[PDB]
Design a protein around this motif. Structure first.
Motif, mmCIF file in Angstrom:
data_model
loop_
_atom_site.group_PDB
_atom_site.id
_atom_site.type_symbol
_atom_site.label_atom_id
_atom_site.label_comp_id
_atom_site.label_asym_id
_atom_site.label_seq_id
_atom_site.Cartn_x
_atom_site.Cartn_y
_atom_site.Cartn_z
ATOM 1 N N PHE A 188 75.383 -58.290 30.698
ATOM 2 C CA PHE A 188 75.953 -59.391 31.475
ATOM 3 C C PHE A 188 74.817 -60.159 32.154
ATOM 4 O O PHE A 188 73.634 -59.819 32.025
ATOM 5 C CB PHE A 188 76.955 -58.895 32.513
ATOM 6 C CG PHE A 188 76.478 -57.710 33.284
ATOM 7 C CD1 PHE A 188 75.446 -57.834 34.199
ATOM 8 C CD2 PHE A 188 77.068 -56.477 33.111
ATOM 9 C CE1 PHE A 188 75.001 -56.750 34.915
ATOM 10 C CE2 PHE A 188 76.629 -55.388 33.827
ATOM 11 C CZ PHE A 188 75.595 -55.523 34.732
ATOM 12 N N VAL A 189 75.201 -61.194 32.907
ATOM 13 C CA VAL A 189 74.285 -62.052 33.652
ATOM 14 C C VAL A 189 74.659 -62.023 35.128
ATOM 15 O O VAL A 189 75.842 -62.077 35.482
ATOM 16 C CB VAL A 189 74.302 -63.501 33.125
ATOM 17 C CG1 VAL A 189 73.370 -64.376 33.941
ATOM 18 C CG2 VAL A 189 73.890 -63.530 31.673
ATOM 19 N N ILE A 190 73.641 -61.945 35.985
ATOM 20 C CA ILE A 190 73.803 -61.917 37.431
ATOM 21 C C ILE A 190 72.934 -63.014 38.041
ATOM 22 O O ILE A 190 72.208 -63.728 37.348
ATOM 23 C CB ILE A 190 73.438 -60.544 38.032
ATOM 24 C CG1 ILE A 190 71.920 -60.350 38.033
ATOM 25 C CG2 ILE A 190 74.108 -59.427 37.249
ATOM 26 C CD1 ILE A 190 71.437 -59.238 38.943
ATOM 27 N N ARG A 191 73.019 -63.136 39.361
ATOM 28 C CA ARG A 191 72.276 -64.133 40.117
ATOM 29 C C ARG A 191 70.981 -63.533 40.662
ATOM 30 O O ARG A 191 70.816 -62.312 40.733
ATOM 31 C CB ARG A 191 73.142 -64.695 41.252
ATOM 32 C CG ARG A 191 72.543 -65.877 42.002
ATOM 33 C CD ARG A 191 73.590 -66.770 42.647
ATOM 34 N NE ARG A 191 74.018 -67.861 41.779
ATOM 35 C CZ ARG A 191 75.067 -68.636 42.017
ATOM 36 N NH1 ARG A 191 75.848 -68.439 43.067
ATOM 37 N NH2 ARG A 191 75.338 -69.636 41.183
ATOM 38 N N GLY A 192 70.052 -64.417 41.037
ATOM 39 C CA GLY A 192 68.730 -63.976 41.452
ATOM 40 C C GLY A 192 68.747 -63.072 42.670
ATOM 41 O O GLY A 192 67.929 -62.159 42.783
ATOM 42 N N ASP A 193 69.664 -63.321 43.605
ATOM 43 C CA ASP A 193 69.727 -62.512 44.817
ATOM 44 C C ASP A 193 70.411 -61.165 44.626
ATOM 45 O O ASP A 193 70.258 -60.292 45.485
ATOM 46 C CB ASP A 193 70.444 -63.277 45.930
ATOM 47 C CG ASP A 193 69.646 -64.458 46.437
ATOM 48 O OD1 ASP A 193 68.401 -64.373 46.432
ATOM 49 O OD2 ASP A 193 70.260 -65.467 46.843
ATOM 50 N N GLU A 194 71.146 -60.963 43.538
ATOM 51 C CA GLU A 194 72.006 -59.795 43.408
ATOM 52 C C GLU A 194 71.300 -58.591 42.810
ATOM 53 O O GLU A 194 71.978 -57.661 42.361
ATOM 54 C CB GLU A 194 73.234 -60.124 42.557
ATOM 55 C CG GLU A 194 73.966 -61.381 42.955
ATOM 56 C CD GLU A 194 74.964 -61.809 41.906
ATOM 57 O OE1 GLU A 194 74.691 -61.597 40.707
ATOM 58 O OE2 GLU A 194 76.018 -62.363 42.277
ATOM 59 N N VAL A 195 69.968 -58.575 42.799
ATOM 60 C CA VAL A 195 69.258 -57.466 42.169
ATOM 61 C C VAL A 195 69.678 -56.142 42.790
ATOM 62 O O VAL A 195 69.896 -55.148 42.085
ATOM 63 C CB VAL A 195 67.737 -57.683 42.263
ATOM 64 C CG1 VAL A 195 66.991 -56.409 41.903
ATOM 65 C CG2 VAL A 195 67.313 -58.812 41.347
ATOM 66 N N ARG A 196 69.829 -56.111 44.115
ATOM 67 C CA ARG A 196 70.173 -54.861 44.781
ATOM 68 C C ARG A 196 71.584 -54.406 44.438
ATOM 69 O O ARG A 196 71.890 -53.214 44.541
ATOM 70 C CB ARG A 196 70.028 -55.008 46.296
ATOM 71 C CG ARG A 196 70.835 -56.146 46.893
ATOM 72 C CD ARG A 196 72.130 -55.635 47.506
ATOM 73 N NE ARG A 196 72.933 -56.710 48.075
ATOM 74 C CZ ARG A 196 74.189 -56.571 48.475
ATOM 75 N NH1 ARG A 196 74.820 -55.412 48.383
ATOM 76 N NH2 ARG A 196 74.832 -57.624 48.972
ATOM 77 N N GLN A 197 72.460 -55.331 44.039
ATOM 78 C CA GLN A 197 73.871 -54.981 43.931
ATOM 79 C C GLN A 197 74.137 -54.040 42.762
ATOM 80 O O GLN A 197 74.957 -53.121 42.877
ATOM 81 C CB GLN A 197 74.721 -56.244 43.825
ATOM 82 C CG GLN A 197 74.711 -57.070 45.102
ATOM 83 C CD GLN A 197 76.085 -57.585 45.479
ATOM 84 O OE1 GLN A 197 77.100 -57.097 44.981
ATOM 85 N NE2 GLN A 197 76.125 -58.568 46.372
ATOM 86 N N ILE A 198 73.450 -54.226 41.639
ATOM 87 C CA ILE A 198 73.663 -53.383 40.462
ATOM 88 C C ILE A 198 72.774 -52.157 40.640
ATOM 89 O O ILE A 198 71.650 -52.087 40.143
ATOM 90 C CB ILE A 198 73.392 -54.126 39.160
ATOM 91 C CG1 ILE A 198 74.363 -55.295 39.019
ATOM 92 C CG2 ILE A 198 73.555 -53.196 37.979
ATOM 93 C CD1 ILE A 198 73.809 -56.605 39.487
ATOM 94 N N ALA A 199 73.297 -51.184 41.373
ATOM 95 C CA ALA A 199 72.658 -49.893 41.587
ATOM 96 C C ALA A 199 73.722 -48.928 42.091
ATOM 97 O O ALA A 199 74.736 -49.360 42.638
ATOM 98 C CB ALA A 199 71.500 -49.997 42.592
ATOM 99 N N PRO A 200 73.525 -47.627 41.899
ATOM 100 C CA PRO A 200 74.568 -46.669 42.284
ATOM 101 C C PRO A 200 74.657 -46.508 43.794
ATOM 102 O O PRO A 200 73.641 -46.435 44.488
ATOM 103 C CB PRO A 200 74.120 -45.366 41.610
ATOM 104 C CG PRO A 200 73.128 -45.783 40.572
ATOM 105 C CD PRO A 200 72.447 -46.979 41.140
ATOM 106 N N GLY A 201 75.890 -46.463 44.297
ATOM 107 C CA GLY A 201 76.169 -45.949 45.619
ATOM 108 C C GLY A 201 76.270 -46.964 46.739
ATOM 109 O O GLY A 201 76.883 -46.656 47.769
ATOM 110 N N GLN A 202 75.706 -48.158 46.588
ATOM 111 C CA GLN A 202 75.724 -49.113 47.684
ATOM 112 C C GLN A 202 76.978 -49.980 47.589
ATOM 113 O O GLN A 202 77.847 -49.769 46.739
ATOM 114 C CB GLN A 202 74.452 -49.956 47.688
ATOM 115 C CG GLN A 202 74.428 -51.029 46.625
ATOM 116 C CD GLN A 202 73.884 -50.525 45.312
ATOM 117 O OE1 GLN A 202 73.684 -49.323 45.127
ATOM 118 N NE2 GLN A 202 73.662 -51.441 44.377
ATOM 119 N N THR A 203 77.080 -50.969 48.468
ATOM 120 C CA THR A 203 78.203 -51.890 48.514
ATOM 121 C C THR A 203 77.813 -53.213 47.863
ATOM 122 O O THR A 203 76.715 -53.371 47.322
ATOM 123 C CB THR A 203 78.664 -52.104 49.958
ATOM 124 O OG1 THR A 203 79.847 -52.911 49.971
ATOM 125 C CG2 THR A 203 77.574 -52.794 50.765
#
Lengths: 48, 48
Positions: A1-16
């Motif tokens: 898929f494709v994400i936005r530049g700021d969302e790097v942290r979002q695709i990782a286990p356990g966070q919000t």
């Protein structure tokens, strides 16, 4: 898929985050590998 | 000359930010953001 530049942290286990909770989520004990790289020259186009 | 403010007697939903929020840098210490709406806080001090 494709994400936005700021969302790097979002695709990782356990966070919000919006993407995790609503779009793409991983288990608390995920095993695997995650790769992310810019594709501005590839996906972007004139006029958006 | 950082600005300080004290807040009391109000309701503190945090999802309301995400309507148009743009925070590249986020950090929490001593608490989980998920539980934010499920807790009460005696003193609320905001520095900017």
């Amino acid at each position: 898929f494709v994400i936005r530049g700021d969302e790097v942290r979002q695709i990782a286990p356990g966070q919000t985050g919006k993407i995790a909770d609503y779009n793409y989520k991983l288990p608390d004990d995920f095993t695997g590998c995650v790769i992310a790289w810019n594709s501005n020259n590839l996906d972007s186009k004139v006029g958006g | 000359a950082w600005n300080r403010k004290r807040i009391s007697n109000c309701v503190a939903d945090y999802s309301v930010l995400y309507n148009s929020a743009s925070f590249s840098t986020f950090k929490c210490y001593g608490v989980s953001p998920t539980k934010l709406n499920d807790l009460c806080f005696t003193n609320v001090y905001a520095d900017s």
